[PDB]
Design a protein around this ligand. Structure first.
Ligand SMILES: Nc1ncnc2c1ncn2[C@@H]1O[C@H](COP(=O)(O)OP(=O)(O)O)[C@@H](O)[C@H]1O
Ligand SMILES: Nc1ncnc2c1ncn2[C@@H]1O[C@H](COP(=O)(O)OP(=O)(O)O)[C@@H](O)[C@H]1O
Ligand SMILES: Nc1ncnc2c1ncn2[C@@H]1O[C@H](COP(=O)(O)OP(=O)(O)O)[C@@H](O)[C@H]1O
Ligand SMILES: [Mg+2]
Ligand SMILES: [Mg+2]
Ligand SMILES: [Mg+2]
Lengths: 7, 371, 371, 371, 7, 7
């Protein structure tokens, strides 16, 4: 999360 | 005109004018909104809160940080943080002063661009730069050959630099950081029946963190001792007066930095991300960088962390090598300090992006010197 | 009795009996171990997993490849791989068939010696050989005059072998390979917002690499094409079914094969190591070598690579010369195809070292006809 | 005024004023450039380091040798070496002192032309000469009749010189030199899994050669001992602190001077080229040469190379000859010493080409005196 | 890093 | 490679 994808 | 140096770090936004030895503002990088409906209308209660105002009204608020793992997740609440950073904390008009913003390595290109859009078009800054937070910690220590291990709430990164040239192919960013270390303390506090769940309670546990976790020099020995006797246990009073107690949990919390496997990640610990980074650069550039492991950011504050880094990375490195952990006082705030130093240089007046440049080049100007 | 041909590739093992035109078994060469405690005692679970079993269980295992850059970095996980290669994937008793292994040029001498001891004293083979990977390929190409650029997950080799007599002094080994480009693909995908960290995510990145990525014919022009247009944007769904839109990234990922300066290695691009390997040979044979340039191994499968290769060496090489990048379909397993031919080529039936010879001359026997 | 003497060696530049008994400046003939973008602008980096500077900063720089086998391959790099030689290493204005240049035998006309042009027009030297390196070598032992076997980093050559007059038709060149022996040292160290690829790593290998390799007197018995006891094998430690073991490889590297087949060179060994130059000499004088075989240049520094040269060329000569190998100390810088000797003398004070002569007659003066 | 010293 | 047509 936060990440655009992957977290 | 003096420049403004602002570090938008995931826990706190350190801000102030250049050349000074400490920031004029140190407010938690938090925005808050009410969790319940209002009644005493003569108060004129605010549409939103920020910083230590959010610590003041804290128990009645939903709280959020707009920065996570160094990505800005919410540009509206980040713009609130910047509006308060200038117009209340420093009372400056940013439209009249150049600004040095600090940014994490290996972070999405859009964040430099969306930041710069807001800075030139909302806040009308006359000039801007977006310095790599690692480079600043090296400037902060005066040295110009070393490896910066920087870690606060959102990111841990290791960046080696030698004779001032970068080694970008050797940067490692491990997203195990202070926020995560707080999450983990909440889980393990639950083992003794101390419960914390609201975002306000989360930040009480942040407080316990600050003042109660050490990073034992040997985990097997210390865990054996804490299972053998109660002597190591210390207590802390909540804002509601009752005394919590911390035992094994004191050192388990930052043990995660040396065993991220406790938090479910596959990644090797901060000693290993340092060693693997020195091993990513040439053999020449090495013994030197083993004499110069430089620490920065608030999660480097734990008692014994420099000892643990040394007694760990010296077990990874070759024998007949000198390993030293340069862990300065005010490692808490090195980057502001580094940014202040960089803003003091005459030649850095040639590095800035000017608003006149931005208006003619478009967004791609923000990327000339970055990781 | 039919002999066995096994290629110990750093990424995927290819194995089968002689005579066949494709290798029956392809376990991607991976051993993997449980990342967490097993809880369901009724599942009948096992200590560690391999190949497609490792791929099946991927999201709960730490994955290790026991071959890097062709060196067998771990012997127990390699021997586990061979136990699964023979008794599970091929359902053959290696103590009843001669076996031919494959190995990289310039690999450390000790590797061949350990392999030999494991074959003769774990798997009790009757007779054994270890063919130099490139060599096998020209057999797979038919042509007995040519220079082989073999490029797999680990090594890259550029042997020139002429009139069927080798030229070992002219061999160049460049440790840029498919794993290195997988690792670089992680770095560049970060720039648009996508985080990949785990060993399991390395395989998802590998899938993106094997589908959407391709070699630019001219980097600057295609770069500029992005900068002007969305026309090269394509998208891939993760296991979540969320689509990730990658671009400017495809013609960058493998541009590293021609510019290793992107990844902080020092040595020249695979085209330059091709030209420079030819230039090590005696000046007569060069005309024939330029006309017999052979590509092999999975990283030679990028779309556009032939065009780029042919133009790149056409820049480096003389004018009034003809350049033939012989790059067939099925270039991938153009080794366990060459080894199939070599074990079938009955004149070779004296070359297999007998167990009795190894039991007398010890490990020294392996240095029979190698580099 | 004192003339300036410069030995333009392929690996190291030896230089000083005339009449010094040893060179003042002795430095690796390296031009460097940075491999990565510079980021600490306040350091004030310079774009190309030279000599011991480049060797200090080793792993952040690409390292270029501008001289290959006596051929100056890059002129602006070599011009920077001479600039550093004059203004910094010797601290002198080369336009105010005559200059003595050493040059390798059988080296193309254009190299002397461009050396001449750069001296007379970049540096505006007032008078100049270019000496055949072997002349200076023989003169350095104070003798005036013999054959020189010179062997630097770039060229090995044999020159018969009688009553101080050279025999030009009887000269031989063999390009198998110290760099080539460094090359082969890489390859053989790769057998024990010690890889070295970057130019920086090349310099490590050069250092290793210079302290653990030696010429075996008796190759067969030695190599039989090396396959029988570990007592012949020993160790060295990297700039990265870790130890490396040098063994069979110790002698195998320098053996190449006698067996160029080991590097796939069909060219004759140093004992054969010395013999084959003596046998090009007139039948009368061969005796006078055998008492006067002088060795010069740094690759003649291998322990036991004199003993080997003797015991080898013994077999090539007829019985009943005084086959004496002149291998003193100072053979290291002998060529330069000879330059300083010859430069001090009124007879040689006739030889120096006046700038005015070259200015009026163009290259037509040097086109004679190069023979 | 795969080799002994060196990588 | 130094040589104009040879090394
Ligand atoms: N004395 C301390 N001991 C342990 N951790 C600390 C201490 N002081 C601060 N920290 C941690 O550092 C984190 C923020 O670090 P810092 O880098 O200063 O802020 P930012 O990451 O926002 O730049 C905080 O979450 C805090 O938990
Ligand atoms: N279509 C493709 N295009 C480019 N590269 C590919 C493609 N398919 C596979 N690869 C790469 O080839 C690598 C495997 O190389 P291969 O030659 O098949 O075996 P080895 O690595 O043992 O030589 C894989 O890691 C993969 O990244
Ligand atoms: N102790 C030593 N043993 C063997 N070789 C040596 C030793 N010291 C120096 N050398 C070799 O001498 C060579 C250079 O010698 P020198 O003639 O002074 O320079 P150049 O060859 O450039 O004129 C180098 O290639 C180096 O390998
Ligand atoms: Mg920070
Ligand atoms: Mg392969
Ligand atoms: Mg010399």
């Amino acid at each position: 999360p936060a990440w655009x994808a992957x977290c | 005109i003096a420049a403004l140096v602002v570090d938008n770090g995931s826990g706190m936004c350190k801000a102030g004018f250049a050349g000074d030895d400490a920031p004029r503002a140190v407010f938690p990088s938090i925005v808050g909104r009410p969790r319940h409906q209002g009644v005493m209308v003569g108060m004129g209660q605010k549409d939103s809160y920020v910083g230590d105002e959010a610590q003041s009204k804290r128990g009645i608020l939903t709280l959020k940080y707009p920065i996570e793992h160094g990505i800005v997740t919410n540009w509206d609440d980040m713009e609130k943080i910047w509006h308060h950073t200038f117009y209340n904390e420093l009372r400056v008009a940013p439209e009249e002063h150049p600004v040095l913003l600090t940014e994490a390595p290996l972070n999405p290109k859009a964040n430099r661009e969306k930041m710069t859009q807001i800075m030139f078009e909302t806040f009308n800054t006359p000039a801007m730069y977006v310095a790599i937070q690692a480079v600043l910690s090296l400037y902060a220590s005066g040295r110009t050959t070393g490896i910066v291990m920087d870690s606060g709430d959102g990111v841990t990164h290791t960046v080696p630099i030698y004779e001032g040239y970068a080694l970008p192919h050797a940067i490692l960013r491990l997203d195990l950081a202070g926020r995560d270390l707080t999450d983990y303390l909440m889980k393990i506090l639950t083992e003794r029946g101390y419960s914390f769940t609201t975002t306000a309670e989360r930040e009480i546990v942040r407080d316990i963190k600050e003042k109660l976790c050490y990073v034992a020099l040997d985990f097997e020995q210390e865990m054996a001792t804490a299972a053998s006797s109660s002597s190591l246990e210390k207590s802390y009073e909540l804002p509601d007066g009752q005394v919590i107690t911390i035992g094994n949990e004191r050192f388990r919390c930052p043990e995660a930095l040396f065993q991220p496997s406790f938090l479910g990640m596959e990644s090797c610990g901060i000693h290993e991300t340092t060693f693997n980074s020195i091993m990513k650069c040439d053999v020449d550039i090495r013994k030197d960088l083993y004499a110069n492991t430089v620490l920065s950011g608030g999660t480097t504050m734990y008692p014994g962390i420099a000892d643990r880094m040394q007694k760990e990375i010296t077990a990874l490195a070759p024998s007949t090598m000198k390993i030293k952990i340069i862990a300065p006082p005010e490692r808490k705030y090195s980057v502001w300090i580094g940014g202040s130093i960089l803003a003091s240089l005459s030649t850095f007046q040639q590095m800035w992006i000017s608003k006149q440049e931005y208006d003619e080049s478009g967004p791609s100007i923000v990327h000339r010197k970055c990781f």
